[PDB]
Write a protein that holds these residues in place. Structure first.
Motif, PDB file in Angstrom:
ATOM      1  N   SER A   1       0.572  -1.240   0.054  1.00  9.38           N
ATOM      2  CA  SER A   1       0.127   0.085  -0.077  1.00  9.38           C
ATOM      3  C   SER A   1       0.852   1.382  -0.030  1.00  9.38           C
ATOM      4  N   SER A   2       0.937   2.106  -1.215  1.00  6.93           N
ATOM      5  CA  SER A   2       1.563   3.294  -1.147  1.00  6.93           C
ATOM      6  C   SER A   2       1.037   4.215  -0.125  1.00  6.93           C
ATOM      7  N   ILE A   3      -0.119   4.333   0.064  1.00 10.37           N
ATOM      8  CA  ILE A   3      -0.930   5.539   1.015  1.00 10.37           C
ATOM      9  C   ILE A   3      -0.327   5.117   2.572  1.00 10.37           C
ATOM     10  N   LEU A   4      -0.287   3.650   2.567  1.00  8.05           N
ATOM     11  CA  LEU A   4       0.103   3.227   4.190  1.00  8.05           C
ATOM     12  C   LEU A   4       1.560   3.655   4.330  1.00  8.05           C
ATOM     13  N   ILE A   5       2.525   3.446   3.391  1.00  8.37           N
ATOM     14  CA  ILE A   5       3.800   3.565   3.395  1.00  8.37           C
ATOM     15  C   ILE A   5       3.816   5.099   4.028  1.00  8.37           C
ATOM     16  N   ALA A   6       3.299   5.989   2.859  1.00  8.34           N
ATOM     17  CA  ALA A   6       3.451   7.523   3.021  1.00  8.34           C
ATOM     18  C   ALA A   6       3.062   7.917   4.381  1.00  8.34           C
ATOM     19  N   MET A   7       1.792   7.333   4.952  1.00  6.72           N
ATOM     20  CA  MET A   7       1.356   7.660   6.299  1.00  6.72           C
ATOM     21  C   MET A   7       2.065   7.289   7.269  1.00  6.72           C
ATOM     22  N   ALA A   8       2.552   5.902   7.392  1.00  2.68           N
ATOM     23  CA  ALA A   8       3.247   5.382   8.300  1.00  2.68           C
ATOM     24  C   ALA A   8       4.567   6.530   8.659  1.00  2.68           C
ATOM     25  N   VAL A   9       5.130   6.711   7.371  1.00  2.00           N
ATOM     26  CA  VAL A   9       6.423   7.419   7.530  1.00  2.00           C
ATOM     27  C   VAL A   9       6.120   8.934   8.231  1.00  2.00           C
ATOM     28  N   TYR A  10       5.021   9.537   7.411  1.00  2.00           N
ATOM     29  CA  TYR A  10       4.742  10.738   8.184  1.00  2.00           C
ATOM     30  C   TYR A  10       4.641  10.757   9.643  1.00  2.00           C
ATOM     31  N   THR A  11       3.738   9.586  10.226  1.00  2.00           N
ATOM     32  CA  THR A  11       3.277   9.664  11.327  1.00  2.00           C
ATOM     33  C   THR A  11       4.406   9.337  12.207  1.00  2.00           C
ATOM     34  N   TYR A  12       5.303   8.341  12.075  1.00  2.00           N
ATOM     35  CA  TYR A  12       6.374   8.031  12.925  1.00  2.00           C
ATOM     36  C   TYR A  12       7.718   9.112  12.862  1.00  2.00           C
TER      37      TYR A  12
END
Lengths: 39, 463, 107
Positions: free
Chosen positions: B167-178
């Motif tokens: 999941s592209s969106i999950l990757i971006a979102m997890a990186v942003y979050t952490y």
DNA sequence: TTTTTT
């Protein structure tokens, strides 16, 4: 007046409390440090 | 029981419904062998849609409220579900988005367990659920319960990394979050240990999937610059600046990142649902002048701990980039965003936070392009400066000073672009009549003459 | 019905208000704890006296539905109360529009 | 199981 000593103090305080990258400025207006991209 | 309640709290409609569904399920499964129990379930699910929903919701609620029965109820749920557990994932998202703060500790534990199972089962939309879960991790909050969630989600994403990569969106979102959460994790051995896990995870994704992370836009740069002094990120910065193609052949330079706006979903993910609900209310329903108790309530809940300082920046970016009030709210007496910004600035007690806050406020100015960007992102800074001029001239002065200084300093090889951006910002502010004239601001008699000379030297066309 | 419609002697009052302040607690008589909370809707504010438990659970910002409330005058001030068969229920937080003035609990 | 309460 002690602008350079205030700059170094502010930068050292930032390094103790933050992982951000900062540089010093001879600001008279509360910008003794600026967050900038790494150099 | 799903939720914490006091004798003062009204009954929760969602909790009550899930409790009935659980009652239906046990009515058809209690006092019988598991053969007869499974048969009744499978027979009842056939009755139609609402019966099917009742069973799935009931097994779900059993999983959350009964750990001893959880494994079996999940097996059964995976069997009887005729919609790929779609209705269970909807209810999970609802619980997370609406009820998390009241969700009991054992139920929280169970819900983390359930999500891990859904991920392992490759359930459709499990990535959406993961993103909803991360939103409940509060920035600027190092309490045990919050640290627990941060590490629990990180562990799921870490041990299911191959699944994450789908999941592209999950990757971006997890990186942003952490990337953001890393800022708060220091001061204890537990926090330092967590931070190391978070750093390794973020770097790994950034290096393996940089193009997906680029989806974030320019705020990725802001996040990365706030963690620049962590050795692993110090190393990544060398690559971003001096060897960008090592990250991807399509990443030729940080400019392309700085020139792409951050979409609302990333700015929003770093406010909890409650923070966001309260902020959205203040900016749409509260009249200017009547904002004082709302601010004190908000401050007392989210802005009172020394660790809460880092939250100011998320709030500021959210106000600038997500909250774009309709023309009705703009042309009304409603609490304006500049006033929210002004308030958030004064809550900055430390110089680091104040400094970061100013950059945050100005971040869309730096590479502003009228085609790419919205004037609503740059509006708050110029209005804070304008409206603070009489009440609090120190605010106007520090922001004006910051503006001139950031231009050559933010990233010197791109100085020409940054100047062009601030210029384009000021110019677009004028030609869209947000502030018709800059001279009464830039050459205000109240301003320090040194500052006035700085402004005239750097922006002659506006003095 | 709104805060502005509250008159002394009225009962069966059903209204929704947001809590602005919670004053200091007083003991006595039967070890009962009572405090006055300042509550409001868009028409204005009023004092409600709350006994014991709800008193301790109530927080500024709480959006609260009162059922079967009644009003009377206490120490010169029009005061709201929870009546027989009624109760206070918290239905939310923060997100209510209110007016601090007129204060209907003024002498 | 307060409660035209103090």
């Amino acid at each position: 007046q002690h602008i350079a000593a205030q700059q170094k103090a502010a930068l050292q305080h930032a390094h103790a409390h933050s992982s951000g990258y900062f540089i010093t400025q001879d600001s008279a207006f509360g910008n003794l440090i600026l967050p900038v991209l790494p150099r | 029981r799903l939720l914490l309640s006091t004798s003062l709290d009204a009954k929760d409609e969602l909790e009550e419904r899930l409790e009935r569904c659980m009652s239906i399920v046990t009515s058809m499964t209690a006092g019988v062998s598991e053969r007869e129990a499974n048969d009744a379930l499978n027979a009842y699910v056939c009755k139609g849609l609402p019966q099917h929903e009742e069973i799935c919701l009931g097994l779900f609620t059993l999983i959350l409220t009964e750990p001893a029965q959880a494994q079996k109820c999940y097996r059964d749920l995976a069997l009887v579900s005729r919609d790929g557990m779609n209705i269970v994932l909807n209810k999970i998202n609802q619980i997370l988005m609406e009820k998390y703060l009241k969700l009991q500790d054992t139920c929280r534990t169970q819900l983390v367990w359930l999500v891990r199972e859904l991920v392992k089962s490759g359930v459709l939309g499990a990535d959406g659920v993961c993103m909803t879960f991360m939103k409940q991790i509060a920035g600027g909050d190092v309490t045990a319960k919050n640290i627990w969630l941060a590490e629990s989600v990180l562990d799921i994403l870490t041990e299911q990394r191959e699944w994450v990569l789908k999941s592209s969106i999950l990757i971006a979102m997890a990186v942003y979050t952490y990337l953001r959460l890393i800022v708060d994790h220091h001061g204890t051995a537990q926090l330092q240990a967590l931070r190391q896990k978070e750093v390794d995870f973020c770097i790994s994704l950034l290096r393996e999937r940089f193009m997906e992370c680029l989806m974030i836009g320019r705020d990725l740069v802001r996040l990365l610059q706030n963690v620049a002094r962590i050795p692993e990120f110090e190393l990544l910065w060398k690559d971003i600046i001096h060897n960008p193609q090592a990250l991807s052949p399509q990443f030729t330079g940080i400019l392309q990142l700085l020139q792409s706006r951050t979409s609302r979903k990333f700015l929003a993910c770093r406010l909890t649902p409650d923070m966001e609900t309260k902020l959205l209310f203040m900016t749409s329903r509260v009249r200017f002048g009547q904002q004082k108790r709302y601010q004190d309530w908000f401050q007392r809940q989210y802005l009172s701990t020394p660790d809460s300082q880092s939250l100011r920046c998320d709030l500021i970016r959210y106000i600038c980039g997500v909250v774009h009030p309709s023309n009705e709210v703009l042309s009304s007496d409603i609490l304006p965003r500049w006033a929210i910004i002004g308030w958030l600035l004064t809550t900055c007690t430390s110089n680091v936070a104040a400094s970061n806050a100013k950059l945050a406020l100005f971040y869309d100015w730096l590479f502003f392009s009228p085609d790419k960007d919205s004037i609503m992102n740059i509006e708050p800074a110029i209005l804070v400066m304008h409206h603070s001029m009489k009440p609090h001239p120190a605010i106007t002065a520090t922001l004006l000073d910051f503006m001139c200084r950031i231009i050559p300093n933010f990233y010197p090889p791109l100085e020409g672009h940054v100047r062009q951006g601030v210029f384009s910002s000021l110019n677009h502010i004028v030609e869209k009549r947000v502030l018709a004239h800059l001279a009464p601001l830039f050459d205000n008699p109240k301003l320090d003459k040194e500052l006035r000379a700085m402004l005239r030297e750097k922006f002659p066309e506006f003095c | 019905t709104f805060v502005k419609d509250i008159k002394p002697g009225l009962k069966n009052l059903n209204l929704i208000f947001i809590v602005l302040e919670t004053g200091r607690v007083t003991k006595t008589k039967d070890g009962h704890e009572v405090r006055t909370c300042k509550v409001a809707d868009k028409t204005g504010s009023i004092n409600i006296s709350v006994w014991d438990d709800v008193g301790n659970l109530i927080q500024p910002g709480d959006i609260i539905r009162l059922t079967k409330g009644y009003a009377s005058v206490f120490k010169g001030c029009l005061t709201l109360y929870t009546g027989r068969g009624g109760d206070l229920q918290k239905i939310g937080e923060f997100c209510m529009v209110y007016s601090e003035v007129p204060n209907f609990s003024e002498p």
